[PDB]
Amino acid sequence: TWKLNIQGKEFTFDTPTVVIRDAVIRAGLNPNQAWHIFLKVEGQPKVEKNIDDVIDLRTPGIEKLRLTPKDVNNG
Amino acid sequence: TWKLNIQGKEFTFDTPTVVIRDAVIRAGLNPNQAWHIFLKVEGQPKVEKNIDDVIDLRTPGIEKLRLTPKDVNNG
Amino acid sequence: ASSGNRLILTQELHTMLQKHLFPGDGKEAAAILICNRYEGGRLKLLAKELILVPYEECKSRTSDFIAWPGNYLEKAIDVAEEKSMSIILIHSHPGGFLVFSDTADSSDMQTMQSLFQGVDAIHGSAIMIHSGEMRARLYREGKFAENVELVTVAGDDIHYWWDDKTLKPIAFTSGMTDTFQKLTAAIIGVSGTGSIVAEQVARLGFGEILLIDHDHIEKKNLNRILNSTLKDALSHRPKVDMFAEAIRCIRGEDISRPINNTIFSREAVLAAANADVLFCCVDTYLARMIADRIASSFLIPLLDVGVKIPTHVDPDDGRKITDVTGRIDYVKPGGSTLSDRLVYTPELIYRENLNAEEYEEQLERGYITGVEEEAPSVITLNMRAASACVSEFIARCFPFREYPNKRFTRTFFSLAGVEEDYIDESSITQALNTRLAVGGEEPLLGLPELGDK
Amino acid sequence: ASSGNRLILTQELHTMLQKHLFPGDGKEAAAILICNRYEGGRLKLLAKELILVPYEECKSRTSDFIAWPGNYLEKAIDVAEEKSMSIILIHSHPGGFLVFSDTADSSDMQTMQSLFQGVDAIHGSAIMIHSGEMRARLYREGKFAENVELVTVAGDDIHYWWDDKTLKPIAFTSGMTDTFQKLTAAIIGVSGTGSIVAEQVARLGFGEILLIDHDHIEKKNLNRILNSTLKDALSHRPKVDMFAEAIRCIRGEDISRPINNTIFSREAVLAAANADVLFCCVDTYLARMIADRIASSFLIPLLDVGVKIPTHVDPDDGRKITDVTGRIDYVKPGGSTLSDRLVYTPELIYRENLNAEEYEEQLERGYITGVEEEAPSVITLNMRAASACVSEFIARCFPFREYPNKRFTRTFFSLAGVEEDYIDESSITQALNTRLAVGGEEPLLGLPELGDK
């Protein structure tokens, strides 16, 4: 199997390639909330992605698919 | 000539290789104060150096030779 | 301090003017700046248009003197006639000039009288040096009058050119303190983040501090509001009134101006328009838009701060913090706005206004997105965000960073992810700013709800 | 809250014990913990030694029961005889046991009576579950007595196992607030950084807050000290007394304990020894060493915060800020100390003690280094450092980060360089900690100046 760390927690997947949205739903996050989806790869700067984009967990160096609240407006 | 950015300010040198201590003195910093000397190279993590170590400004990617106070104890 | 006049220029205008005035020949050059004005507690000249006289059309361009045609003076007159705009002539460091015409040559004083004959308004004559520092004088009734107290340009770096001034102080010194003592600072929102920002402003030594909030202290917020007491919570003391008394006791002088009202009011807008710096620490998208429109209209630098602790239900563990995040946005007049940055959008403001049932219905329809769940606010994060907010102002007024301040136009830090990203002004797309230097033109801030009519 | 007993274990001991008690066979296991004690405002059992009974030497190791030899009980007795140390037997989750001997078999109550016959001191019997959560009971005079209120292990993650407890609260919630309400927090240094830390602790809802400083409010520090007034500066009010009254008004209860003394005093040390967490916000190398020795002796987690704004004279520009820096160090009992991290050294403390002439002479000789020049302290940096300090405590008590807390054993941020580096506990070399769980053994903190004799 192939594993992807979502928001700091590693989740195992039965497919070599998993859609962002699917991995996001596996972690308990809402894909249709407003998020800034980013993927990390060792030796590479973080790259912004789409909720429906598909990732390949076989990609070497894959670190974490982390989301950051798109709107941060609390006082 | 070869230039090295010290503490955010670029200083030009007439030698291809300049001793840390010399470059530090050119910037106005005291080499015999307690500092953590670090050098940055694009595409590489920062590497700690010695006050007497010698640098080669021809090294491609050379970014900045920055010092950080070794002892930070103010309240 | 409070009633000091101001001459504000956008960075774009200043850079254009600076280049026109200092081409490199070592000789004089001339230009005209048409400005609108705001006249509240102080006078503010809001630069709007710029006219540059060609060197070729000038006659005696020498190192000390320049003679230029009156025709360019006559354009400014007509450009400033509809709104009786002010007209401020600019020249190079010496500033010696005459306005030659078809009939004869006019002296500096004659031309200021002519400008006032054309437009019934305050005018002025200013000088720039190579560095860009500007000094100016006002001519009321076309006659030598009061000198401009402050000429300011809030760009990536914030510039304050005082008339009393004749080296630049480094950050954190007495020179910084004295600069702040001569400035006004508006705090929009005094709860959680804003109480921390207000505290810093007061102890930094700001001469005048405005406070704009409609809420009041309560038991719930005794964990976040600085200077709040249980007694304040039992009396439901207005947050602005509480902090005003605090500042009073701290400074030993009543330098605060409490406004127990929402920023979405003429009172607040017109008070905030006198500030030299805006600190937006609200928690509504609508209030962010108001602050954004005030900053553009009255050419006031703006620092918007926000935090958020989203939460989600993990499949196995259960409720879990999604992230712990903060945001600091620096908005310079003429640069990218909070709107450009999507800090607020029309959809977000519309969803905020929806009533309970309204929200529910729309959410099901898919027309509006779903609000994220969050954890309770904590003073630790509020402090981390607010300290970076004021530090941003200090760093732009008294550069100490080893990178251009433009690099940090936007800051986003994550305490859960342990990350901190910076956005450059050059990576932000900008729309046409139709509010820039508009002032109090009605409808106020282009909002009919605030309109005087 | 204040007079609640504690059972403290180092992470090293707990991990060893946990593994002995839960090998994986699903059966019971036994162990003995020899502890010293501190008896100030509360009772604290400071774990020092651990004895693990072999499974092979046990008889009826079943899922619910275990029978082990008395010989291991007799070692603990003698190990605890010199200092009349406490002896706390530990067992697996059920906890059912007997101590078989050459003659006959003793019940749980008989063995506690035997332990007290050997050593005239408080003893106890504790239970661990697979997770590691521990529950314990004290046997005074070898007889069933009071139950342990809190069993705690301050490691990379801070664990609080309360007797009243029977899910873990996430950070920032009411569960966090209630945990803090049951704990004590000592603030060593209440000026600049420490006043910000004290403010956060109070509004976070800490049940008891100690304040240890000898200095007093003055005009100079009205730009940094929270809750300070000009009146306080004119009266030279002790900084601790000022903040104590502030906390009082904020919380509505006198939960603060002002100590107008230096940490280098028996009074301060013995008050701080009752704290559940130490916040070191001093500005002397000597005071850092004292805090470091208290944390090791009384097994108290420690959070040391420091800032600095070095300055240099640039050849062309002139005086320039060299850097704007902050430091946060988390020290867990049994882990790397501030000494190991070189936060203080013998040379640095010696140079601090030198008088004016002394310093000058030595500096010329080259024997001592030269103190760096600095810019005046500013509340913005103090706040940035102090908010990260308390956030570190929150993150270790209620993990919310996406990386192990060990990764952030040390934090160094630079506001001028715009950098922030983290040091892992595993990258820090450690010396033999000869103060660990020592308590108030004389000389106090191993310092003859503080000694009672």
Side-chain angles (χ1 to χ4, degrees):
Chain A
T1 43
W2 309 258
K3 39 182 221 199
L4 192 73
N5 172 332
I6 315 305
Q7 226 68 7
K9 181 172 176 188
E10 256 166 358
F11 300 107
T12 319
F13 287 86
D14 300 307
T15 166
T17 51
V18 196
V19 197
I20 292 309
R21 185 169 306 241
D22 286 285
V24 194
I25 271 176
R26 182 86 56 87
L29 304 211
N30 178 343
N32 285 294
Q33 279 183 29
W35 296 105
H36 272 135
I37 289 93
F38 274 116
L39 167 66
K40 172 51 194 177
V41 197
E42 290 163 54
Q44 248 68 63
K46 74 173 185 169
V47 153
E48 192 179 4
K49 323 299 317 309
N50 187 260
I51 310 86
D52 279 296
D53 285 1
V54 199
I55 301 323
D56 190 0
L57 305 317
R58 292 161 319 203
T59 321
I62 284 309
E63 159 147 17
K64 193 203 322 288
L65 181 71
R66 200 183 192 285
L67 318 189
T68 87
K70 182 161 194 198
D71 318 304
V72 184
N73 175 3
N74 216 318
Chain B
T1 43
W2 309 258
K3 39 182 221 199
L4 192 73
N5 172 332
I6 315 305
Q7 226 68 7
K9 181 172 176 188
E10 256 166 358
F11 300 107
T12 319
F13 287 86
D14 300 307
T15 166
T17 51
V18 196
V19 197
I20 292 309
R21 185 169 306 241
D22 286 285
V24 194
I25 271 176
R26 182 86 56 87
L29 304 211
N30 178 343
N32 285 294
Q33 279 183 29
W35 296 105
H36 272 135
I37 289 93
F38 274 116
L39 167 66
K40 172 51 194 177
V41 197
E42 290 163 54
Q44 248 68 63
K46 74 173 185 169
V47 153
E48 192 179 4
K49 323 299 317 309
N50 187 260
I51 310 86
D52 279 296
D53 285 1
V54 199
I55 301 323
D56 190 0
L57 305 317
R58 292 161 319 203
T59 321
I62 284 309
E63 159 147 17
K64 193 203 322 288
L65 181 71
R66 200 183 192 285
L67 318 189
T68 87
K70 182 161 194 198
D71 318 304
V72 184
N73 175 3
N74 216 318
Chain C
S2 314
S3 306
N5 75 58
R6 313 294 200 196
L7 172 54
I8 305 101
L9 280 80
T10 56
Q11 168 176 23
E12 188 180 287
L13 286 179
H14 184 253
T15 306
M16 215 198 306
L17 174 67
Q18 189 283 342
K19 278 152 180 200
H20 186 65
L21 289 184
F22 293 96
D25 59 355
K27 306 167 170 182
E28 302 222 321
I32 314 183
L33 190 78
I34 326 300
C35 317
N36 297 297
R37 78 185 60 76
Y38 176 63
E39 302 168 305
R42 72 221 301 130
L43 173 69
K44 294 174 67 171
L45 282 314
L46 313 181
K48 189 85 183 101
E49 324 283 356
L50 174 63
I51 312 171
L52 305 176
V53 317
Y55 317 131
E56 271 292 291
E57 286 199 69
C58 298
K59 298 176 168 176
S60 270
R61 288 189 76 254
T62 189
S63 65
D64 178 319
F65 190 76
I66 208 186
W68 48 284
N71 177 251
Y72 283 102
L73 202 83
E74 251 295 342
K75 291 150 177 170
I77 288 146
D78 281 355
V79 172
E81 61 121 355
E82 174 172 352
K83 283 144 154 229
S84 303
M85 288 163 82
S86 280
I87 311 189
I88 302 175
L89 285 56
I90 326 296
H91 303 282
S92 287
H93 148 57
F97 76 103
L98 76 80
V99 175
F100 78 77
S101 188
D102 294 4
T103 48
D105 304 6
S106 294
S107 76
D108 69 24
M109 292 292 314
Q110 295 172 249
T111 86
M112 299 310 318
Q113 235 301 335
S114 323
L115 284 160
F116 166 49
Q117 279 302 329
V119 201
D120 181 3
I122 302 161
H123 294 319
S125 182
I127 304 174
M128 178 175 303
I129 65 180
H130 181 246
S131 86
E133 165 155 17
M134 284 174 71
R135 67 183 148 262
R137 168 171 305 286
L138 307 188
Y139 286 71
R140 204 125 25 198
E141 298 297 24
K143 298 140 187 166
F144 188 113
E146 65 196 4
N147 209 55
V148 166
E149 181 194 330
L150 175 64
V151 184
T152 178
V153 163
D156 307 307
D157 297 315
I158 287 159
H159 306 297
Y160 293 122
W161 306 309
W162 304 95
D163 157 67
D164 208 302
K165 197 104 71 165
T166 297
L167 306 180
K168 171 157 189 175
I170 72 194
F172 317 123
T173 60
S174 53
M176 176 186 85
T177 306
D178 301 321
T179 297
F180 294 169
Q181 294 257 332
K182 297 187 271 222
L183 298 161
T184 291
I187 319 295
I188 310 173
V190 199
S191 178
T193 57
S195 69
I196 302 163
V197 167
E199 180 80 19
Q200 291 175 103
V201 166
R203 297 195 179 276
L204 290 171
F206 276 71
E208 172 165 310
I209 300 158
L210 281 39
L211 308 163
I212 308 179
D213 202 347
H214 216 179
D215 294 358
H216 53 248
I217 308 279
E218 275 193 9
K219 293 178 183 177
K220 55 167 196 122
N221 56 53
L222 293 182
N223 66 319
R224 290 162 288 171
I225 324 281
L226 306 189
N227 306 295
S228 71
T229 74
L230 168 71
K231 288 181 178 177
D232 299 354
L234 293 158
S235 44
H236 292 33
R237 183 173 185 180
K239 297 181 191 174
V240 292
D241 294 354
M242 187 282 302
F243 219 98
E245 182 65 1
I247 291 169
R248 185 195 85 70
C249 294
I250 295 162
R251 303 285 296 273
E253 35 183 346
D254 196 7
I255 61 138
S256 153
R257 298 291 166 243
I259 297 182
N260 194 359
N261 209 352
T262 176
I263 196 67
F264 193 54
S265 42
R266 314 196 90 249
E267 170 180 8
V269 171
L270 299 180
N274 293 119
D276 293 83
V277 51
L278 301 181
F279 289 105
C280 189
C281 316
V282 307
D283 65 332
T284 55
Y285 293 112
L286 190 270
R288 300 265 200 232
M289 183 254 270
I290 303 303
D292 205 37
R293 302 214 179 186
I294 297 158
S296 294
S297 300
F298 305 99
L299 301 179
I300 314 177
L302 172 64
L303 282 161
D304 194 59
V305 68
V307 287
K308 194 201 203 74
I309 312 173
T311 206
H312 76 287
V313 153
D314 177 291
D316 310 338
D317 311 0
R319 197 195 179 185
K320 197 151 293 220
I321 293 175
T322 309
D323 202 358
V324 181
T325 62
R327 178 181 54 76
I328 295 93
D329 287 350
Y330 172 67
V331 174
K332 67 188 172 177
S336 70
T337 64
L338 297 174
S339 177
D340 298 335
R341 298 174 206 188
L342 309 184
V343 176
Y344 63 92
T345 74
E347 189 163 60
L348 288 166
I349 293 168
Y350 159 71
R351 181 184 59 170
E352 195 168 67
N353 187 44
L354 289 173
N355 296 26
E357 294 193 5
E358 321 192 302
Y359 171 95
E360 308 151 8
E361 321 186 358
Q362 281 292 64
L363 179 67
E364 307 173 1
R365 310 311 305 143
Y367 301 150
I368 71 176
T369 61
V371 172
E372 320 172 38
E373 279 115 310
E374 311 190 7
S377 299
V378 66
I379 200 168
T380 61
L381 175 62
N382 296 345
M383 209 157 303
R384 169 70 174 75
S387 63
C389 196
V390 179
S391 183
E392 187 75 40
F393 186 70
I394 296 165
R396 298 196 179 262
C397 290
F398 304 103
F400 56 78
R401 297 167 167 162
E402 301 176 355
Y403 303 76
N405 277 299
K406 194 183 191 183
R407 304 276 217 91
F408 319 104
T409 291
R410 315 196 71 189
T411 302
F412 292 89
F413 68 77
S414 172
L415 311 186
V418 182
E419 305 175 345
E420 192 167 19
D421 301 317
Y422 304 108
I423 316 299
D424 191 302
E425 165 78 352
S426 71
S427 73
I428 310 171
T429 301
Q430 317 182 12
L432 216 78
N433 190 359
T434 58
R435 294 258 106 218
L436 199 54
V438 165
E441 184 181 59
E442 300 294 351
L444 181 67
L445 301 183
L447 295 183
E449 307 80 310
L450 304 169
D452 199 0
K453 174 179 174 178
Chain D
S2 314
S3 306
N5 75 58
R6 313 294 200 196
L7 172 54
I8 305 101
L9 280 80
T10 56
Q11 168 176 23
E12 188 180 287
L13 286 179
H14 184 253
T15 306
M16 215 198 306
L17 174 67
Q18 189 283 342
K19 278 152 180 200
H20 186 65
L21 289 184
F22 293 96
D25 59 355
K27 306 167 170 182
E28 302 222 321
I32 314 183
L33 190 78
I34 326 300
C35 317
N36 297 297
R37 78 185 60 76
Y38 176 63
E39 302 168 305
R42 72 221 301 130
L43 173 69
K44 294 174 67 171
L45 282 314
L46 313 181
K48 189 85 183 101
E49 324 283 356
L50 174 63
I51 312 171
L52 305 176
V53 317
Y55 317 131
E56 271 292 291
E57 286 199 69
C58 298
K59 298 176 168 176
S60 270
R61 288 189 76 254
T62 189
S63 65
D64 178 319
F65 190 76
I66 208 186
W68 48 284
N71 177 251
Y72 283 102
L73 202 83
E74 251 295 342
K75 291 150 177 170
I77 288 146
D78 281 355
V79 172
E81 61 121 355
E82 174 172 352
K83 283 144 154 229
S84 303
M85 288 163 82
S86 280
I87 311 189
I88 302 175
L89 285 56
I90 326 296
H91 303 282
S92 287
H93 148 57
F97 76 103
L98 76 80
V99 175
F100 78 77
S101 188
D102 294 4
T103 48
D105 304 6
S106 294
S107 76
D108 69 24
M109 292 292 314
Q110 295 172 249
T111 86
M112 299 310 318
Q113 235 301 335
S114 323
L115 284 160
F116 166 49
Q117 279 302 329
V119 201
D120 181 3
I122 302 161
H123 294 319
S125 182
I127 304 174
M128 178 175 303
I129 65 180
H130 181 246
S131 86
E133 165 155 17
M134 284 174 71
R135 67 183 148 262
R137 168 171 305 286
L138 307 188
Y139 286 71
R140 204 125 25 198
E141 298 297 24
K143 298 140 187 166
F144 188 113
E146 65 196 4
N147 209 55
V148 166
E149 181 194 330
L150 175 64
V151 184
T152 178
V153 163
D156 307 307
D157 297 315
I158 287 159
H159 306 297
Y160 293 122
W161 306 309
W162 304 95
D163 157 67
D164 208 302
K165 197 104 71 165
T166 297
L167 306 180
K168 171 157 189 175
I170 72 194
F172 317 123
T173 60
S174 53
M176 176 186 85
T177 306
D178 301 321
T179 297
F180 294 169
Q181 294 257 332
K182 297 187 271 222
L183 298 161
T184 291
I187 319 295
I188 310 173
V190 199
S191 178
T193 57
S195 69
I196 302 163
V197 167
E199 180 80 19
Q200 291 175 103
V201 166
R203 297 195 179 276
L204 290 171
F206 276 71
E208 172 165 310
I209 300 158
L210 281 39
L211 308 163
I212 308 179
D213 202 347
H214 216 179
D215 294 358
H216 53 248
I217 308 279
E218 275 193 9
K219 293 178 183 177
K220 55 167 196 122
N221 56 53
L222 293 182
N223 66 319
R224 290 162 288 171
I225 324 281
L226 306 189
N227 306 295
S228 71
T229 74
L230 168 71
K231 288 181 178 177
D232 299 354
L234 293 158
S235 44
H236 292 33
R237 183 173 185 180
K239 297 181 191 174
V240 292
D241 294 354
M242 187 282 302
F243 219 98
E245 182 65 1
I247 291 169
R248 185 195 85 70
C249 294
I250 295 162
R251 303 285 296 273
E253 35 183 346
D254 196 7
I255 61 138
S256 153
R257 298 291 166 243
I259 297 182
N260 194 359
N261 209 352
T262 176
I263 196 67
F264 193 54
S265 42
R266 314 196 90 249
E267 170 180 8
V269 171
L270 299 180
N274 293 119
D276 293 83
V277 51
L278 301 181
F279 289 105
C280 189
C281 316
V282 307
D283 65 332
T284 55
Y285 293 112
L286 190 270
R288 300 265 200 232
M289 183 254 270
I290 303 303
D292 205 37
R293 302 214 179 186
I294 297 158
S296 294
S297 300
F298 305 99
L299 301 179
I300 314 177
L302 172 64
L303 282 161
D304 194 59
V305 68
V307 287
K308 194 201 203 74
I309 312 173
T311 206
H312 76 287
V313 153
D314 177 291
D316 310 338
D317 311 0
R319 197 195 179 185
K320 197 151 293 220
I321 293 175
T322 309
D323 202 358
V324 181
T325 62
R327 178 181 54 76
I328 295 93
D329 287 350
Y330 172 67
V331 174
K332 67 188 172 177
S336 70
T337 64
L338 297 174
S339 177
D340 298 335
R341 298 174 206 188
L342 309 184
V343 176
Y344 63 92
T345 74
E347 189 163 60
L348 288 166
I349 293 168
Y350 159 71
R351 181 184 59 170
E352 195 168 67
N353 187 44
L354 289 173
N355 296 26
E357 294 193 5
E358 321 192 302
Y359 171 95
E360 308 151 8
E361 321 186 358
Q362 281 292 64
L363 179 67
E364 307 173 1
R365 310 311 305 143
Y367 301 150
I368 71 176
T369 61
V371 172
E372 320 172 38
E373 279 115 310
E374 311 190 7
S377 299
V378 66
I379 200 168
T380 61
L381 175 62
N382 296 345
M383 209 157 303
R384 169 70 174 75
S387 63
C389 196
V390 179
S391 183
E392 187 75 40
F393 186 70
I394 296 165
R396 298 196 179 262
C397 290
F398 304 103
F400 56 78
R401 297 167 167 162
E402 301 176 355
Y403 303 76
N405 277 299
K406 194 183 191 183
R407 304 276 217 91
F408 319 104
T409 291
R410 315 196 71 189
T411 302
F412 292 89
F413 68 77
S414 172
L415 311 186
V418 182
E419 305 175 345
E420 192 167 19
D421 301 317
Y422 304 108
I423 316 299
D424 191 302
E425 165 78 352
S426 71
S427 73
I428 310 171
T429 301
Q430 317 182 12
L432 216 78
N433 190 359
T434 58
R435 294 258 106 218
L436 199 54
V438 165
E441 184 181 59
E442 300 294 351
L444 181 67
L445 301 183
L447 295 183
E449 307 80 310
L450 304 169
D452 199 0
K453 174 179 174 178

